[PDB]
Amino acid sequence: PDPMKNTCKLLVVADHRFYRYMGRGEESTTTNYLIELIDRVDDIYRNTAWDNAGFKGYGIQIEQIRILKSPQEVKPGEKHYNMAKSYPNEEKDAWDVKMLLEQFSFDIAEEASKVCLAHLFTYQDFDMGTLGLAYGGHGGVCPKAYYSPVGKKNIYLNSGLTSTKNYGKTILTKEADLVTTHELGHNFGAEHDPDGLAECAPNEDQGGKYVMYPIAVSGDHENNKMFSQCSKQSIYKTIESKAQECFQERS
Numbered sequence: 001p002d003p004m005k006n007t008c009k010l011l012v013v014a015d016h017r018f019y020r021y022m023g024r025g026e027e028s029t030t031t032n033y034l035i036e037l038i039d040r041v042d043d044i045y046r047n048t049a050w051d052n053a054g055f056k057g058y059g060i061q062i063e064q065i066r067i068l069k070s071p072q073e074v075k076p077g078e079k080h081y082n083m084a085k086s087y088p089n090e091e092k093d094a095w096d097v098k099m100l101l102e103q104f105s106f107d108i109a110e111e112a113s114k115v116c117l118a119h120l121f122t123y124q125d126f127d128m129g130t131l132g133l134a135y136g137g138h139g140g141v142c143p144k145a146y147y148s149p150v151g152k153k154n155i156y157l158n159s160g161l162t163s164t165k166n167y168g169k170t171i172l173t174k175e176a177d178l179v180t181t182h183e184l185g186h187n188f189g190a191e192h193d194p195d196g197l198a199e200c201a202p203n204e205d206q207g208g209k210y211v212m213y214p215i216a217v218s219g220d221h222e223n224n225k226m227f228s229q230c231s232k233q234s235i236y237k238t239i240e241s242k243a244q245e246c247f248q249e250r251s
């Protein structure tokens with residue numbers, strides 16, 4: 001492990017929804033919530049031994065927090081991830097999750113090209129219990145260009161998002177930590193843990209499921225906050241190929 005290339009620096013974005021409902025319309029409340037969440041997610045990453053030996057100490061740190069205090073004004077027919085209305089259905093509390101992640105990646109493209117990862121934090125009730133989405137596991141850690149035929153420019157796939165609203169209420173901070181860990185897990189190259197591999201999806205008596213299980217882990221079982229051996233094997237291959245490309249020294 002290279003100590004000069006062991007940290008994935010993040011551009012963290014809080015949209016107007018997050019600012020209003022999680023930050024109570026205050027910059028200090030907004031940033032403290034995000035700073036503490038990323039630090040606890042960093043504890044999971046930094047303590048993970050990707051090869052089950054000495055290949056550990058890889059983590060995440062915030063480089064910048066963008067705080068969008070108000071909705072982004074748009075021209076008729078124009079969209080933006082920070083706009084007041086949801087898309088494609090303005091009558092719903094939330095955007096379609098896939099369309100929102102693509103829109104965010106489009107709008108933040110210039111900034112995303114300069115950072116290991118960009119992550120959107122929002123407050124909207126995605127359909128069917130969805131809490132977040134991310135590229136990777138193409139895309140994930142280090143900007144990878146995608147030419148958007150619709151957008152007519154390159155966007156970067158080093159992005160993901162977390163919503164702290166689910167089923168009409170604010171999720172627990174212990175649940176929010178798990179969402180962001182799972183989304184960044186996909187960015188780091190992990191796919192979902194399959195039922196077919198008991199080592200990677202244990203029963204409740206064996207500590208329960210790991211963070212990459214497709215059904216949202218609650219955080220009450222031991223394994224919930226941890227990466228399975230399946231995730232470790234996938235991520236180990238990524239870190240070994242990506243740290244030299246865009247990781248930096250821990251601050």
Ligand SMILES: COc1ccc2[nH]n(C[C@@]3(c4ccccc4)NC(=O)NC3=O)c(=O)c2c1
Pocket residue numbers: 097129130131132133134178179180182183186211213214215216217
């Ligand atoms: C620990 O937090 C978790 C754990 C599992 C989760 N599953 N989902 C839905 C989901 C998705 C994939 C494709 C389309 C829509 C949603 N997003 C994601 O990253 N994995 C998916 O299956 C969460 O939102 C989620 C959050």
Ligand SMILES: [Zn+2]
Pocket residue numbers: 182186192214
């Ligand atoms: Zn997932």
